């Protein structure tokens, strides 16, 4: 049903996202348990990690488009990624290594993310009707890898330790590279321009040098979040000013500002919602016992099942507004479960968390998936970079919002933690509901501006 290179890109992307979500699923628990961070420290450190993971994407798009070529940069990204996972496994012997290992993952991610997508676009004649189908199968590829990693990584880490989980992340990347190399021949005539000239060693060294510098800068920022704050503040004012110098820019700007709120909410899944599942939810569903950290897999689960249904099924600004309302309902549901449907011992049914992740995933499908493809088309390299930047700033903010649910290490009673999660989720739901209302109010105006 698809070109032969499509399956290749599908499985490369699957295994890379597997490696990334293996870390994401266990990283906050790892900070707290393995490194002895407080919950506040782990949450803000995770926010800075995620911020760098997503604000660097633009570097990798540039390196693929203009310096080394899409396919070369896929290979180099997968190698830096694999090295980062094995360094993280090695952090258990050498704890001082931890922040360098994470910086290496972030930079590797910055290099890799833009390029398989970029490659896949070039697998199809420009108006091939399969394209939309292809890119939905791309999102599902991402979400299958995510679904497997978020499911298994916590179990693995519990039974075999973190070093093994992180080495298996590395190995996921190794086999991503193996399947790329084995199928190299399928993308012979596919690539960006530097893919078809011999490789410039000048530029390759500039890219390596700049990568290593960035690894050290990321490690520093992750260790000193209190200045990552100022750095991303100065950058945001700077990027916005250049954007204004360059009215359909206003439309992308407002939809980006609303996306930021979405990303604050998405950043709770590995942090506050993770610890809410650990602390105040029954760890048994349909009669099976589970690792509560595996609950994060409910987000890719719901995307994998919903995205076929929601491909077959106003326009853009309404779509963003709907997404905002669903996210609001997800947090309002979480608060309600805590306020009214908990046990005498302070625990809630995992079915409430299933419903929370359903709402949050539908929000995701209406904003972050749809938003990328069509906001870009409506607007170009600069706007993707600024979107990635506002996403990074959103993730830092998300870590700081997560800090309000943080639980001291000595509390053992769920009836003490439930009201903290319930107050914070309720307030997040109510602010996101207001945000969705103002969004709706601006839908007609902004939809005139699209004309």
């Amino acid at each position, epitope marked *: 049903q698809q070109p032969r290179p499509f399956f290749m890109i599908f499985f490369v992307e699957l295994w890379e996202r597997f490696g990334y979500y293996g870390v994401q699923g266990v990283l906050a628990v790892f900070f707290v348990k393995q490194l002895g961070f407080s919950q506040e420290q782990a949450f803000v450190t995770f926010g800075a990690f995620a911020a760098l993971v997503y604000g660097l994407i633009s570097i990798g798009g540039y390196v693929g488009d203009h310096l080394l070529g899409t396919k070369r940069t896929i290979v180099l990204g997968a190698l830096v990624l694999a090295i980062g996972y094995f360094m993280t496994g090695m952090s258990l012997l050498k704890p001082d290594l931890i922040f360098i290992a994470l910086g290496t993952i972030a930079v590797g991610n910055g290099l890799f993310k833009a390029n398989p997508a970029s490659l896949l676009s070039k697998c199809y004649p420009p108006k091939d009707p399969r394209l939309d189908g292809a890119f939905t199968l791309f999102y599902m590829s991402i979400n299958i890898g995510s679904l497997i990693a978020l499911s298994l990584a916590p179990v693995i880490a519990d*039974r075999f330790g973190y070093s093994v989980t992180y080495n298996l992340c590395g190995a996921g990347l190794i086999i991503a590279l193996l399947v790329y190399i084995a199928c190299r021949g399928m993308v012979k005539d596919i690539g960006s321009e530097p893919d078809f000239r011999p490789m410039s060693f000048s530029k390759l060294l500039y890219v390596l040098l700049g990568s290593v510098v960035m690894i050290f800068v990321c490690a520093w920022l992750m260790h000193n979040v209190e200045v990552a704050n100022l750095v991303l503040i100065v950058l945001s004012i700077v990027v916005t000013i250049i954007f204004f110098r360059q009215n359909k820019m206003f439309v992308a700007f407002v939809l980006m500002l609303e996306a930021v709120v979405f990303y604050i909410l998405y950043a709770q899944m590995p942090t506050s919602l993770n610890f809410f599942a*650990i602390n105040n939810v029954h760890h048994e569903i349909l009669g099976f016992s589970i690792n509560p950290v595996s609950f994060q897999a409910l987000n890719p689960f719901w995307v994998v099942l919903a995205s076929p249904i929601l491909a077959g099924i106003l326009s853009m600004p309404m779509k963003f507004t709907l997404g905002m309302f669903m996210c609001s309902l997800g947090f309002l549901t979480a608060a309600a479960a805590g306020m009214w449907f908990a046990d005498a*011992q302070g*625990l809630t049914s995992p079915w409430f968390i299933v419903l929370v992740y359903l709402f949050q995933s539908l929000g995701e499908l209406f904003i972050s998936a749809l938003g990328l493809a069509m906001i870009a088309a409506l607007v170009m390299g600069f706007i993707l970079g600024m979107w990635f930047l506002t996403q990074a700033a959103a993730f830092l903010l998300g870590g700081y919002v997560a800090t309000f649910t943080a639980v001291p*290490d*000595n509390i053992t009673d769920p009836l003490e933690t439930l009201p903290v999660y319930t107050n914070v989720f309720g307030k997040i739901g109510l602010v996101t509901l207001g945000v969705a209302v103002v969004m709706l109010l601006m839908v007609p105006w902004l939809k005139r501006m699209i004309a």
Partner: nanobody
Amino acid sequence: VQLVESGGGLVQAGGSLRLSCAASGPTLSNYAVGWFRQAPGKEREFVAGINWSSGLRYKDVVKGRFTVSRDNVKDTVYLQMNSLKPEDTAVYYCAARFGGMLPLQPSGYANWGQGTQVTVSS
């Protein structure tokens, strides 16, 4: 995933016993371990526990007599019971729940030992 309790037995009023809970597969380090006890014709009740980061919870009637502790190297959890009284007589079970909480009821815990009998004689 499966816990084993040891150390029970028979002791005279005001003496001491030491239960130990050990796990097999997973590292017990990620788990709050709660000790429950069932006396003849009564419900399982929470006695004492330690979470995954050294926070402690106790039933009122055992404070200042029982101590829960954890050897994270041997991956083992202990219940030292001093000043044992006849009404401490029960089957004692250890239970494991992932994370930092010690809920008071048995439904909060998925992993369970078989139990060891503790008898305190007047």
